[PDB]
């Protein structure tokens, strides 16, 4: 028998997109979610596959230094990475492939080796992008509510709460995670992060974890310390850029960053950083929501007090925004799975860089402040006491609790499937 000759490999975009909840992403390239089967159809130019004669082996690789030990390379025969025949007709062979639910996310190249007992011939079948899979029970990001998966993964428009505890407002926001080119930009963001630049092979392996990815994104959304997206500015002078209040969605920001060679975009503030992080994380398939905290404290000396010095100082903000992302935490003691707070707005350094989280919101509520990452900082944002050091005419300083301004009020995120505000204060702090 002569060797097989491949005409083309059909990546079955329409069917895969629908099944994998990636239809908007699959206009031009295959995008699938890990842990779940997808279809491919091979078209042969002479004879078809014959099981008695042909042995077919598949190989997948991601990133610049793939290896089987790191999970960034796998080899598997047509019989966790698997391939099986589903149909055979004239010149075509219909296959189903499956990936592990813990596979590193990103761009893979898929190849085929074919043999009839002598020399093998190799073909590149194409590329696909593998994403987190909130529909898959074995995936760390599994979320067992369809209405919540719709909200926190698939919906591209939401609302962000702003203003003050006394005067709540909101703006609409276009997350736009499935608009053309955005996924490509998300992968660029991962591929220019400092951990990649330092050890690409390790970084690519570690992208199996939503914890690692979440932490990476919290750092890369701000331009501080790295090649990240946004420059913050707070002094009301935005003439040489875009005012933070002008943006209506994330896509203009991410396109601007890409188009100028990963140059910082001017300008953002909290809700801008949070919204862009939400876009990136929803895009990669991690269920994510934007949260607003009113009277949001910035503790500068980790003592869980907000200290003001007054006549005969740390700051509290009218509001602050960050994101929560849904995942298990196998890096912690059991019980901390669910919503994790991630904060891309530069405030305090974490191990020398401007990143923050992920921290289980549950750890914040229960005061388990040794729980990684950055639990004391986030605890103080929502539950610090305010102390006034008031100088007395006699020269002494009286320390008093100020109860006029309470830290951490009316914590808010958009309601699932409706244009209304959900109060989630109860998830961060017990009532007193």
């Amino acid at each position: 028998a002569e060797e097989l000759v491949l005409e083309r490999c059909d990546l079955e975009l329409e069917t895969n997109g629908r099944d994998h909840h990636t239809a908007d992403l699959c206009r031009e390239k295959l995008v699938v979610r890990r842990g779940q089967p997808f279809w491919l159809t091979l078209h042969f130019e002479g004879r078809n596959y014959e099981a008695s004669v042909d042995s077919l082996t598949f190989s997948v690789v991601t990133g610049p230094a793939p290896s089987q030990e790191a999970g960034t390379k796998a080899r598997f025969p047509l019989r966790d990475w698997t391939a099986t025949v589903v149909d055979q007709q004239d010149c075509t062979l219909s296959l189903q492939l499956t990936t592990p639910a813990n596979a590193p996310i990103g761009l893979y190249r898929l190849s085929l080796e074919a043999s009839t007992g002598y020399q093998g011939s190799s073909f590149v079948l194409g590329h696909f992008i593998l994403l987190f899979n909130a529909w898959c029970p074995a995936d760390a990001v599994y979320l067992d509510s369809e209405e919540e998966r719709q909200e926190y993964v698939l919906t591209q428009q939401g609302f962000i709460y702003q203003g003050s505890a006394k005067f709540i407002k909101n703006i609409p926001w276009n997350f736009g995670q499935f608009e053309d080119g955005i996924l490509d930009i998300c992968l660029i963001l991962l591929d220019v992060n400092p951990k990649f630049l330092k050890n690409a092979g390790r970084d690519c392996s570690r992208r199996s974890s939503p914890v690692y990815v979440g932490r990476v994104v919290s750092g890369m959304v701000n331009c501080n310390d790295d090649q990240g997206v946004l420059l913050g500015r707070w002094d009301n002078n935005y003439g040489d850029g875009v005012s933070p209040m002008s943006w209506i969605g994330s896509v203009d920001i991410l396109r601007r960053w890409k188009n100028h060679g990963c140059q910082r975009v001017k300008y953002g503030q909290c809700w801008v950083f949070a919204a862009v992080a939400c876009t990136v994380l929803r895009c990669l398939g991690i269920p994510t929501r934007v949260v607003t905290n009113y009277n949001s404290a910035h503790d500068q000396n980790s003592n869980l007090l907000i200290e003001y010095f007054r006549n005969e100082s740390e700051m509290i903000w009218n509001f602050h925004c960050w994101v929560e992302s849904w995942m298990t935490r196998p890096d912690l003691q059991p019980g901390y799975e669910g919503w994790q707070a991630l904060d891309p707005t530069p405030q305090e350094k974490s191990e020398g860089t401007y990143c923050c989280g992920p921290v289980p919101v549950r750890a914040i509520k229960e005061g388990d402040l040794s729980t990684k990452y950055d639990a004391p900082f986030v605890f103080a944002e929502v539950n610090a006491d305010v102390v006034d050091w008031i100088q007395q005419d006699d020269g002494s300083v009286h320390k008093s609790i100020n109860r006029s301004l309470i830290v951490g009020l009316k914590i808010s995120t958009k309601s699932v499937g409706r244009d209304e505000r959900e109060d989630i204060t109860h998830t961060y702090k017990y009532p007193e």
């Binding site: 933070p244 503030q269 009277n295 700051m315 903000w317 009218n318 602050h320």
Partner: peptide
Amino acid sequence: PAXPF
């Protein structure tokens, strides 16, 4: 904008 009280 975000404003420090």
